[PDB]
C-alpha cells in the first residue's frame, strides 16, 4: 500500500507539473498572437513604458487568462487544437487523467468483460464453484493478478 | 588609471585650476584634427628617425604658428621626454569625455520603427523626469526583438531599465515555471 | 640488485644467527645456573 | 588610523590604496564589512600610496574598494599566564571555545634577535629515558634539538614521548606549535595533556572557566589554515615563549611540528609577491627568513629556552635546501630512517647520522664519549661489511669478523626500546631507561661479557635484567 | 498539496505583481574571459553571460576581472554584456543526490528527472576545528582481507591508494562500495548506514557508465552518487568535482549519519589547477604547478573528520586515488598526499603480475590509526600474519637460491605462501567481516600449511560455502560480539577440522 501512495503522489505532482506548463506555454502563444494581430497593444505598450519610465498588455492579459482559466471545470471542454487556452489545455488535463486512471486503476471493459462473460455464467445466489467452466478460468486468474497487483 | 588616463587626470586638473578648460580643451581638439587630418604629423610623431630636438622645435614652433597654451605645451615636453607622445591621441579622447559627461550625458535607445513626434515628445520627457538631469542628447535606434516597446540605456552603465515587450513576457514566464 | 642484496643479506644473517642463539639457549642454562629457576 | 582601499585581489595577497599615511612593512590591517574577522599583513610597498599585503584567513568574499583599517603594529598576540592551558590562533584568538584570552600585555611576533653579547650558558645535559638518544646524542638543556625524518617514522610520536618524559617533571614552562601538521594530531595531544595534568581545565557553574596549573601553551597554525598562517603562527608561538624566557626569567620548552611547513608558505606567496624562484622550487628568502627565527630561539643571561623541531624530509632526501639550511642551525641533531624502522627497531633513530655538539669528552666524561664511539665504530665496521655477506655469505667471514657482526646486531636490537605513547599500537608498556644504565649495558655488551646470550633478548628491553630474564624464559620454553 | 484551478492560478495572480551590476566582455580565450566592469564582484563569485553560459570569477585584478568559463567560448563575443548573481559558487545537498549521476555543479545527467534537493550548501568552506571532533573507534569494512586485516581503515579517516596505472585502484574502491549494501540492507538505522560519493575527476565517460553498470548490476546505487568531471568537462568543472563531493559528504558528516568519498584521479585536479593558473597568467612552481598545491588539498582533505557527540557524531572517511610514474613517490603530488593522510596503501605492477590480485605490498602500506580501526577478532589474527608475513618477507629472497634450511624456517615460508596465497581475491568478490575471520583463523592456526599452494583457490570457496551454508550461527555470533570467545572458537575448530574430513585436497 505504502509503495502504491508513493506511486500515486508522483503521479498527482507530475500530473501539475505538466498541467501548470502547457497552462504557461499556451498562454505565452496566446499572447504571441494576439500582439502581432492588434494594433491597439502596441501603443498600449508605448504608454505603459511611458507611465513606467517614473498594467502593461502582458500582465493585463496573462492575468486575464489566469482568471478565466480558474473557474473552468476542465472537464468540460473541448479537443486539442480547440483554440482558447481552456480547450487548449483541458485536453491535455483529460488525457492525463484517463492515462492516470487507467493504470492506477481497473477498467470498465475488463469488469464488464467478466461480470457478464465469466462470473455470473457459473451459478447465481451464491456463485459456488468454478469446475463448471472453460480453460480461461486461467485467464480470469491472470486478470486476478492484473488488479490486484494494479490496486 | 592608465598612462593616458594619469595625464588626461592632471590636464584636466590643472585646466580647471588655472589657466582655463575651454581653452586647453579646444588645444587638444585641434590638436587631434590636425592629426586625423594632416597624415603626416601623426607619423613625424610615431617616427624614431626625429631627434628629440627636432621635436620640441616643431612642437614649440606649432605652439607659436597656432593658438596654443602653456600647460598643453608641457604636456607635449613631459610625453617627448618620457617618450609617449604617440598617446596623445588617447589622452585627447580622455580630455574629451570628462567635460561633456560633467555637462550632459549622451544616451542609447532603441525602438521597432519610427515613432511619432507626439510619443518621442513623451519619451524624452519622461526620461528627463527620470534623470533629473537638466541637459540629455540621446540617440534612437531599430531592433526588433524587443517588439515594439521602448527599450533604451541611460549611458552610465549601472542603469540599464529594459522597459521592452519580449523580455517581461521572458522572464515571467521562466517565473511562472516555477513549482507551486 | 639493491634490494636484492639487502634482502639476501637480511635472510641469510637471519638464518645463521637463529642457528646460533637456538645453540646458546641449549647451552646457556648449564653454564650459568645462577639464571636457572630451576634452583630457586 | 587611517583608512584604505582594496584595490585587486589574487589568492592570498591583496593590493591596498591609502590616501595618506602609508603603513610601515610588516603592519597589520583588518577588513572592514567581512563576514568574520580579516587580518592581513603588510610584506612590501609598490609606490603611488599603494601596498601588498598577505592574508590570514581566506579571501573568499572580498571585493575591490572594501575597507581596511590600518592598526598602527604587527599582529599582536596577547601574553602572560593566562594564555597557558588555553589553545590560540596565529593572531592570538582561541579556537579552544572556552571564552577570551583575559591577557593584561600583548607582544607583536616580529621582534629583533638578542644580539652576539647576550651569550649563552653551559651545555645543560637533558635526560629523555631514551637510550640511543641519552647515548648517542645527548640533549642540551638550552638548545636547539632536530628531529630529522620523512613519513612515518616516529617523530610526532617521539616528541609525544619526549613531552611524557620531559615536561611532566620540568618546573618551567612550556610551548607547543603545530605549522602544518593534522588536526586529529593536534585533538590527541589536547586530550593526551587534559588527561596528564599538562593542562588543567576546570568549568564553573557560571559558564566561565579556570586553567589554573597548565604549565604548556599551544599553537595552532594547522594544514586548514592558509599561508601567512602557516608561516607567522611560529613567530606567534615564539613571541609567546620570548615573554616567559625575558620577563619571567622562566625556563622554557619549545616543541615544533613540521617547520618544513613554515618554508613551504614561504615559497607559496614568493611567485604572488613578485620573486623570481630560486633553485628546485623554494623560495630566495628563505636563509634570511630563517635566521630570523632561530637567532631568536636562542639562550640568554636572563633565560633558556630548549627547542625541538621536526624536520620533515621529502623523499628522504637531505640534500633538500630547507634541511641543508637547517642542519647548521642546531646543536643537536636525530636522523630517523626507514631502512631501520622497516626492522622494527623502534625508536628507528641512525646512529651514524645523528650528532650532538655536546658529545665532547669534556662535557661527558671518556666513559660515555670513548663507548659512545665504540659503538659507532662497531656499527661502521658492521655497515663495511653488508655487500661481502650480500655477495659471498657469512661463511667466508673470520671469527673476529662474526663476533663484531654478532655485537653489531645486538646492539641494533638493544638500542630499541617500547614508549608509552606505542601502547595503542604495540600494546607492550613504556620504560624510562637512565643513562648509566645505558653505558653499563653498552659497555657490557662491547666488552663481551654477553655474547653467550641470543639476539632476541635484546629486543624492546630499557636494561640487561630483562635481557637475561627473556633468554631464561626463551631457554625454558626451548625445553 | 494544493489543486490547480482554484488556488494555484490565484497565487500565480498573486505573484506576478512587479516592478522597479553588469560588465562587457573585453578579452577572450581558451575557456577563459577577461571584462571590464562589476566593481562589486565578490572574489570567487557566480557570473552570468548572455547566453546561458555561467562563470566563476577568480582574479579581480584593477582594470579587469578574471572569469573562468563552464563551457565552450564559441558563445563569448568579446564585448557581450555579462552579469554577477551575488551568489558564491554553491551545489545542492540531500537523498536526492542518492540513485543519481550529476557534474561538477549538481547538474544531473543520468537523463532522468531534476534534482529534488532544497538545501544548498557553499563549495569552499572551513574544515571543522580541534574541539568539535573525536578518535576514531568504529571500523569501514572494505570487504576485502589484506585491507580489513593489515592496512584497516575507520570511519573518519583518510587513507591514501597509491599505484600505477591499471593495477586495481578502481576496483578496490568499487569492492569497499559494494561491501556495504549488506550492511545498510540489514538496518534501517541511518547512524549505521554507510552513504557513498564517488568523485571521477578525467575519466571517460566509457569508464564511468561501466562503474554505473557495475553498481547498478548489484544494486549498488540506492546509497551511493557519483561526480562525473571528465575529460571534456571544462577545467573548472574538474576543478571543482571534489569540492563538490565534499561538500555533498559534509550533509552526512553534520547530520548524524556517515559517508565514505572517493576521489578517483586526484591527480587531474591538480593538471585543471596548473592549466588555469597559466591561462590566468599567474606564475608555476616547480613540474609548472603552482605553490597554492598543498592549500589545494588541504582544504579538500581536512573536511575528513569524525564529529563527537554533540554535532551528532557523524563522520567522513577519505580514500583518495593516486596515479605514479615509474614508482616514482619521490614527486612532488604524491610527496604531499602522502605527507598529508593517515596511512598508505602502495600498489604494484610486479605483484600484479607475480599472481597477487589485489597487489598490496602490506610493507610499504600502512595505517597510522591501526588497530584502533580494526575487530577484536580481526585484531588476534592479524597481528600473529603481520608479524609471519615480515618473517617470510625477509627469507624468502634469501630461500629463493636453492639453499637447503631447518624446519623452523619451512615453516615461515610455507606459512607465509600459504597467507599469500589466502589474500587473493577475484574483482567484485567482496566478503564479509566474519567470513574473513574464519579464513584467517583457517590460514593462521597451520589448515593450510601442508595443503598445495595452488588449491587454497578453492579451499577457500568451499570452506565459505560450507561456514555459510551450515554454520551461520558462528558468523551472526562474530557479528554481534564482535570478538573469539573459546565458545566460538572450540566451534570453529570443529567446523573446520568437519570440512577437511568432508573434503579432500592434493595434500
Ligand atoms: N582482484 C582482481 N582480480 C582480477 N583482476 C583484477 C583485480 N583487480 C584489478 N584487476 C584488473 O586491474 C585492471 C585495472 O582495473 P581498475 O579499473 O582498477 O584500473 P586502475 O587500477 O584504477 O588504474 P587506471 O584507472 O589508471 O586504469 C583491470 O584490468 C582489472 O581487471
Ligand atoms: N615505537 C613505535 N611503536 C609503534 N609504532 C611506532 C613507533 N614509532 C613510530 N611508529 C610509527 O610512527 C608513525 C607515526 O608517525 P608520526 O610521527 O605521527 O608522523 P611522521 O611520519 O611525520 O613522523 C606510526 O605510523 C607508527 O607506525
Redesign the pocket.
Given at each position: 500500500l505504502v509503495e502504491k501512495l508513493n506511486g500515486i503522489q508522483q503521479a498527482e505532482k507530475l500530473i501539475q507539473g505538466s498541467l501548470q506548463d502547457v497552462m504557461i506555454r499556451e498562454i505565452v502563444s496566446s499572447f504571441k498572437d494576439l500582439y502581432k494581430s492588434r494594433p491597439e497593444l502596441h501603443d498600449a505598450a508605448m504608454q505603459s513604458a511611458i507611465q513606467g519610465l517614473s498594467m502593461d498588455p502582458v500582465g493585463a492579459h496573462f492575468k486575464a487568462s489566469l482568471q478565466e482559466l480558474a473557474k473552468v471545470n476542465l472537464s468540460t471542454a473541448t479537443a486539442d487544437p480547440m483554440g482558447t487556452v481552456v480547450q487548449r489545455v483541458a485536453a491535455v488535463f483529460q488525457k492525463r487523467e484517463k492515462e492516470f486512471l487507467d493504470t492506477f486503476t481497473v477498467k470498465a471493459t475488463e469488469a464488464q468483460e467478466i461480470k457478464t462473460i465469466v462470473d455470473k455464467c457459473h451459478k447465481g445466489n451464491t456463485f459456488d464453484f468454478h469446475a463448471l467452466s472453460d480453460e480461461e478460468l486461467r485467464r480470469l486468474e491472470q486478470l486476478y493478478s492484473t488488479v490486484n497487483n494494479r490496486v | 588609471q592608465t598612462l593616458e588616463g594619469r595625464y588626461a587626470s592632471a590636464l584636466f586638473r590643472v585646466a580647471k585650476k588655472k589657466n582655463q578648460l575651454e581653452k586647453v580643451y579646444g588645444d587638444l581638439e585641434s590638436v587631434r584634427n590636425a592629426l586625423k587630418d594632416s597624415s603626416e604629423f601623426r607619423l613625424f610623431v610615431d617616427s624614431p628617425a626625429v631627434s628629440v630636438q627636432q621635436k620640441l622645435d616643431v612642437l614649440r614652433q606649432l605652439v607659436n604658428r597656432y593658438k596654443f597654451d602653456p600647460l598643453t605645451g608641457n604636456l607635449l615636453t613631459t610625453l617627448v621626454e618620457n617618450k609617449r607622445l604617440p598617446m596623445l591621441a588617447r589622452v585627447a579622447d580622455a580630455f574629451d569625455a570628462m567635460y561633456r559627461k560633467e555637462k550632459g550625458e549622451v544616451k542609447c535607445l532603441v525602438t521597432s520603427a519610427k515613432p511619432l513626434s507626439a510619443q518621442q515628445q513623451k519619451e524624452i520627457v519622461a526620461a528627463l523626469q527620470n534623470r533629473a538631469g537638466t541637459q540629455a542628447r540621446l540617440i534612437i535606434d531599430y531592433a526588433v526583438s524587443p517588439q515594439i516597446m521602448g527599450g533604451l540605456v541611460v549611458r552610465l552603465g549601472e542603469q540599464v531599465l529594459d522597459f521592452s515587450v519580449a523580455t517581461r513576457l521572458d522572464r515571467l514566464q521562466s517565473q511562472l515555471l516555477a513549482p507551486l | 640488485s639493491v634490494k636484492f642484496m639487502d634482502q639476501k643479506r637480511s635472510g641469510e644473517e637471519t638464518v645463521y644467527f637463529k642457528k646460533e642463539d637456538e645453540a646458546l639457549l641449549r647451552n646457556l642454562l648449564a653454564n650459568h645456573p645462577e639464571y636457572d629457576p630451576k634452583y630457586s | 588610523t587611517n583608512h584604505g582601499r582594496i584595490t585587486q585581489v589574487i589568492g592570498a595577497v591583496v593590493d591596498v590604496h591609502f590616501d595618506e599615511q602609508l603603513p610601515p612593512i610588516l603592519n597589520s590591517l583588518e577588513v572592514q564589512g567581512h563576514t568574520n574577522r580579516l587580518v592581513l599583513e603588510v610584506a612590501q610597498h609598490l609606490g603611488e600610496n599603494t601596498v601588498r599585503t598577505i592574508a590570514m584567513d581566506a579571501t573568499e568574499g572580498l571585493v575591490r574598494g572594501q575597507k581596511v583599517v590600518d592598526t598602527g603594529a604587527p599582529i599582536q598576540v596577547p601574553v602572560g599566564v593566562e594564555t597557558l592551558g588555553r589553545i590560540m590562533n596565529v593572531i592570538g584568538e582561541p579556537v579552544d571555545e572556552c571564552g577570551p584570552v583575559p591577557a593584561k600585555k600583548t607582544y607583536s611576533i616580529h621582534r629583533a634577535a638578542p644580539l652576539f653579547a647576550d651569550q649563552s650558558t653551559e651545555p645543560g645535559l637533558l635526560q629523555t629515558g631514551i637510550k640511543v638518544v641519552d647515548l648517542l646524542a645527548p640533549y642540551a638543556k638550552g638548545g636547539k634539538i632536530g628531529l630529522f625524518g620523512g613519513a612515518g617514522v616516529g617523530k610526532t610520536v617521539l616528541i609525544m614521548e619526549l613531552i611524557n618524559n620531559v615536561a611532566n617533571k620540568h618546573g618551567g614552562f612550556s610551548v607547543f606549535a603545530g605549522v602544518g601538521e593534522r588536526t586529529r594530531e593536534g585533538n590527541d595531544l589536547y586530550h593526551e595533556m587534559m588527561t596528564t595534568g599538562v593542562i588543567k581545565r576546570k568549568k564553573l557553574e557560571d559558564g566561565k572557566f579556570d586553567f589554573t596549573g597548565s604549565k604548556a601553551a599551544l599553537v595552532y597554525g594547522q594544514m586548514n589554515e592558509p599561508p601567512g598562517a602557516r608561516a607567522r603562527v611560529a613567530l606567534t608561538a615564539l613571541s609567546v615563549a620570548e615573554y616567559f624566557r625575558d620577563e619571567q626569567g622562566q625556563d622554557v620548552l619549545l616543541f615544533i611540528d613540521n617547520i618544513y611547513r613554515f618554508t613551504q608558505a614561504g615559497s607559496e606567496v614568493s611567485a604572488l609577491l613578485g620573486r623570481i624562484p630560486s633553485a628546485v622550487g623554494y623560495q630566495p628568502t628563505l636563509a634570511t627568513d630563517l635566521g630570523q627565527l632561530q637567532e631568536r630561539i636562542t639562550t640568554t643571561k636572563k633565560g633558556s629556552i630548549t627547542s625541538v623541531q621536526a624536520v620533515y624530509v621529502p623523499a628522504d632526501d637531505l640534500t633538500d635546501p630547507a634541511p641543508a639550511t637547517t642542519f647548521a642551525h642546531l646543536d643537536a641533531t636525530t636522523v630517523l630512517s626507514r631502512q631501520i624502522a622497516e626492522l622494527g627497531i623502534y625508536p628507528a633513530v641512525d646512529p651514524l647520522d645523528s650528532t650532538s655538539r655536546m658529545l665532547a669528552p669534556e662535557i661527558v666524561g671518556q666513559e660515555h664519549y670513548d663507548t659512545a664511539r665504540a659503538t659507532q665504530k662497531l656499527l661502521q665496521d658492521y655497515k663495511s661489511l653488508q655487500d661481502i655477506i650480500a655477495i659471498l655469505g657469512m661463511d667466508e667471514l673470520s671469527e673476529e669478523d662474526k663476533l663484531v657482526v654478532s655485537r653489531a646486531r645486538k646492539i641494533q636490537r638493544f638500542l630499541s626500546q617500547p614508549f608509552t605513547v606505542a601502547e595503542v599500537f604495540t600494546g607492550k608498556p613504556g620504560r624510562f631507561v637512565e643513562l648509566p644504565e645505558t653505558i653499563k649495558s653498552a659497555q657490557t655488551i662491547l666488552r663481551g661479557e654477553c655474547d653467550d646470550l641470543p639476539e632476541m633478548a635484546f629486543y624492546m628491553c630499557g636494561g640487561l635484567e630483562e635481557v637475561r630474564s627473556k633468554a631464561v624464559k626463551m631457554a625454558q620454553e626451548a625445553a | 498539496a494544493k489543486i490547480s484551478p482554484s488556488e494555484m492560478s490565484r497565487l500565480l495572480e498573486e505573484r506576478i505583481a512587479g516592478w522597479k551590476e553588469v560588465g562587457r566582455v573585453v578579452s577572450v580565450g581558451d575557456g577563459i574571459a577577461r571584462l571590464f566592469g562589476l566593481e562589486g564582484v565578490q572574489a570567487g563569485e557566480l557570473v552570468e553571460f548572455q547566453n546561458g553560459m555561467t562563470g566563476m570569477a577568480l582574479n579581480l585584478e584593477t582594470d579587469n576581472v578574471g572569469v573562468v568559463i563552464f563551457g565552450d567560448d564559441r558563445s563569448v563575443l568579446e564585448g557581450d554584456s555579462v552579469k554577477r548573481t551575488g551568489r558564491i559558487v554553491d551545489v545542492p545537498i540531500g537523498p536526492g543526490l542518492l540513485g543519481r549521476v550529476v557534474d561538477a555543479l549538481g547538474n544531473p545527467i543520468d537523463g532522468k528527472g531534476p534534482i529534488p534537493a532544497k538545501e544548498r550548501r557553499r563549495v569552499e568552506l572551513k574544515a571543522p576545528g580541534i574541539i568539535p571532533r573525536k578518535s576514531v573507534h568504529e571500523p569501514m569494512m572494505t570487504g576485502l582481507k589484506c585491507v580489513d586485516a593489515l592496512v584497516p581503515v575507520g570511519r573518519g579517516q583518510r587513507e591514501l591508494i597509491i599505484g600505477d ?7 578496490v574502491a568499487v569492492d569497499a562500495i559494494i561491501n556495504q549494501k549488506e550492511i545498510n540492507d540489514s538496518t534501517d538505522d541511518e547512524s549505521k548506514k554507510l552513504y557513498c560519493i564517488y568523485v571521477a575527476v578525467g575519466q571517460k565517460r566509457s569508464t564511468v557508465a561501466q562503474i554505473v553498470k557495475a553498481l547498478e548490476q548489484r544494486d549498488a546505487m540506492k546509497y551511493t552518487t557519483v561526480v562525473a568531471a571528465t575529460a571534456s568537462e571544462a577545467a573548472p568543472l574538474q576543478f571543482l568535482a571534489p569540492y563538490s563531493g565534499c561538500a555533498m559528504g559534509e550533509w552526512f558528516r553534520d547530520s548524524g549519519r556517515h559517508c565514505v568519498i572517493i576521489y578517483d584521479d586526484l591527480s587531474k585536479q591538480a593538471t585543471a589547477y596548473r592549466q588555469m593558473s597559466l591561462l590566468l597568467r599567474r606564475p608555476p612552481g616547480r613540474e609548472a604547478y603552482p605553490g597554492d598545491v598543498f592549500y589545494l588539498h588541504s582544504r579538500l582533505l581536512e573536511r575528513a573528520a569524525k564529529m563527537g557527540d554533540k554535532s551528532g557524531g557523524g563522520s567522513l572517511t577519505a580514500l583518495p586515488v593516486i596515479?605514479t610514474q615509474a614508482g616514482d613517490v619521490s614527486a612532488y603530488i604524491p610527496t604531499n598526499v602522502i605527507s598529508i593522510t593517515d596511512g598508505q596503501i602502495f600498489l604494484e605492477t610486479e605483484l600484479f603480475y607475480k599472481g597477487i590480485?589485489?597487489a598490496i605490498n602490506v610493507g610499504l602500506s600502512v595505517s597510522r590509526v591501526g588497530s584502533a580501526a580494526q575487530v577484536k577478532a580481526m585484531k588476534q589474527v592479524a597481528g600473529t600474519m603481520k608479524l609471519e608475513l615480515a618473517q617470510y618477507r625477509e627469507v624468502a629472497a634469501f630461500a629463493q637460491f636453492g639453499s637447503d634450511l631447518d624446519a623452523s624456517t619451512r615453516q615461515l615460508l610455507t606459512r607465509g605462501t600459504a597467507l599469500t596465497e589466502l589474500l587473493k581475491?577475484?574483482?567484485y568478490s567482496p566478503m564479509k567481516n566474519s567470513v574473513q575471520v574464519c579464513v584467517l583463523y583457517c590460514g593462521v592456526k597451520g589448515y593450510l600449511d601442508p595443503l598445495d599452494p595452488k588449491e587454497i583457490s578453492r579451499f577457500e570457496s568451499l570452506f565459505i560455502d560450507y561456514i555459510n551454508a551450515n554454520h551461520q550461527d558462528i558468523l551472526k555470533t562474530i557479528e554481534t560480539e564482535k570478538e573469539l570467545s573459546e565458545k566460538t572458537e572450540a566451534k570453529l575448530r570443529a567446523a573446520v577440522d568437519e570440512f577437511v574430513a568432508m573434503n579432500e585436497f592434493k595434500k
Open positions: - | - | - | - | 596505472r591499471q593495477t586495481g585502484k578502481t576496483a596515479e590480485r589485489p581475491q577475484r574483482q
